[PDB]
Amino acid sequence: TFDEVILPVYAPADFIPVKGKGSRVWDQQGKEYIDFAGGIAVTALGHCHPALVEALKSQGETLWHTSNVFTNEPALRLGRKLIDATFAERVLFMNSGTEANETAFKLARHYACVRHSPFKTKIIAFHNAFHGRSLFTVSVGGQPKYSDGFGPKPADIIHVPFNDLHAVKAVMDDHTCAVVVEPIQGEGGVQAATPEFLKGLRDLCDEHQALLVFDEVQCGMGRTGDLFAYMHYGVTPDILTSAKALGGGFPVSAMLTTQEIASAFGSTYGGNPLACAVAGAAFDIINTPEVLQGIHTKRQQFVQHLQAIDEQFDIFSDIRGMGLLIGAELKPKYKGRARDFLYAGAEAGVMVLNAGADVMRFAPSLVVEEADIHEGMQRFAQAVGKVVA
Amino acid sequence: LPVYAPADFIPVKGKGSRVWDQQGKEYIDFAGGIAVTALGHCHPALVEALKSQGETLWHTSNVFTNEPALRLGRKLIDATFAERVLFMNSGTEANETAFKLARHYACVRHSPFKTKIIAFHNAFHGRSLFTVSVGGQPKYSDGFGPKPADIIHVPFNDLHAVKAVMDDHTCAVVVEPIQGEGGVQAATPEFLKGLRDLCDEHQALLVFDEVQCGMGRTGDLFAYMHYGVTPDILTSAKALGGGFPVSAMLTTQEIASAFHVGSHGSTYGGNPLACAVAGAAFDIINTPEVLQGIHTKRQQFVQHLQAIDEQFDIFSDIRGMGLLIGAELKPKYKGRARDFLYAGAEAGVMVLNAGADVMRFAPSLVVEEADIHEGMQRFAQAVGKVV
């Protein structure tokens, strides 16, 4: 049915998920799967979490939609929660990570234009970066194969290697408006920024009067075991973007910044009432000491399994990432074959991810039960075993 | 300039075409959150779809399909020229997908140099850098650094201008069959058919932005059906989810095949919860009875607007299609649209603008006759206060 209905932009699994509860999912044939993928780090509280269902139902019988002309109570409440918990003084709500990034990039550009010079236009970004698939965001993204072939790209974007501080210093000048970076490049093989690199970015932005833009669409909202990855590093950005985990499955996103920067464009703008209600309930759960502590407990449970799998099958050269964003890089013998293990995983009843062709990625619910971790990782071990044999 | 609500106008509850704020003041909703809540607030069918799917499955990623998405895709394909659909979150994203597709199709089918996009003055297509550059308001596209190039703007309804700028290096013509933001201006039959013929001649794709005028708004499922002019690509949002963030890009198999695995496009797009709600909305809007009702209701609004002009002498033109209504103000009241809107709010009726000279109405497609009369009596009161 897929090939007959929707554009040839995706190559989906043979099975169709129909129901989810917690970190378990069922297809049309009733086959049960363990979810270590979370729809690519989106369902951070699992499927149909009672508190998120409650919020959806309660707001759903009250008010769904206002235009950006009006504010609404769920948006104001969520805005306040994000402002109180972060560096942010102002928040702008959208629907997707791409839109949040569009907003952040446009703001950095416009801030430079009005506060400094219309010629202050250079955006520094990184190879293997992913920021979305709109023309602008994909051009800021560091994957030419995704940005090629759509006509003239928005100009004045410069790409250098991730974690290469000297390259950044080399390209930055008084005509630079922003540095855009994922504190951890999720799609780009789960590579975390070094402390010196991220700190260095802050110093260079300060020097050249450019804005440091953190894309935390994937690595934000508790993913790393801190509310946002920047908190782990102790490096404060000028602008931050958040989505995916923000709504635990509901299409929602946020752009966070200071009042000084926001004024280039109330403490909150926009935000769908239904979306913000759900994101509010999601925030309330994730931003607790115990949930954040548990993310680190759960990571080591996952990592110990991956270490045991490697001890058995000689398969991983590296296990990396932060919190419940986990990357397992394949050894040279299994290079380029990440998709093979993902497919065998699904056959064994476990849903995993890739991060390029050389890396297995895990992004489960932040509250995934210990029992589900052990069962799912046993399934993945069997899947690995089938590929090896 | 921009219309913003004060601290004492915060909507907290909606029921049908009525809205209440924090202080419990009741409003009649003729705005629909800018033509979004096409079935009113908290419609029982849409609430039921939201709640039931909400207990089952909200989100899988696009490396999976889902039943609600398949069901909705099938319904759109069966009812339109479309053979393939791509689901996204917003009209902007749908337009991004459409414009990228037209560009990529030309690149692979003809030439990497076939890049020109023809768009129109006063057009609105969204607020991403690309979509706002295709949009026809330079004030909204200025000041964000280098714009994506090869976009040419000409006046809406000016066929000769289009003919003049089009060539073998043109990949697309992008147009709203009715320009909603741009003063509620409908394309003439000659103009829109002319666009089809020119796109045929130059092997360019005709892209209809029906984000505002689509999904029943005009009294047809899509505005293109009224005109009898079939586009190569169509975009839909707003009314599609009746308040739930959802959008769709509609095209043929031949065009869709230009995209391969990885060409696009989304994390949320194709969302099981979104598509279930949109399915329920589609099922209600795409019925002869609701679509007939839209024309009945339009005339009820128009008769009130005519009566207001008879008493107050404020309108020079009443236009639009279905329940997308534009009422242009007379020269003596140029630039007063915002003031009539705020006076409306004071009188307990929510209306829109379409530029500083035009009043816009985009109510629920099933707005009750009683709400129409009451709300327009409130608006007639608001007008009297202004004049």
Ligand SMILES: *Cc1c(COP(=O)(O)O)cnc(C)c1O
């Ligand atoms: C997934 C992701 C995005 C894209 O967000 P959408 O919701 O797909 O628009 C952008 N940036 C990063 C780092 C991401 O991981």
Ligand SMILES: *Cc1c(COP(=O)(O)O)cnc(C)c1O
């Ligand atoms: C409202 C509108 C859009 C924007 O859609 P979003 O959902 O706001 O991204 C684009 N084009 C037209 C014609 C519109 O009316």
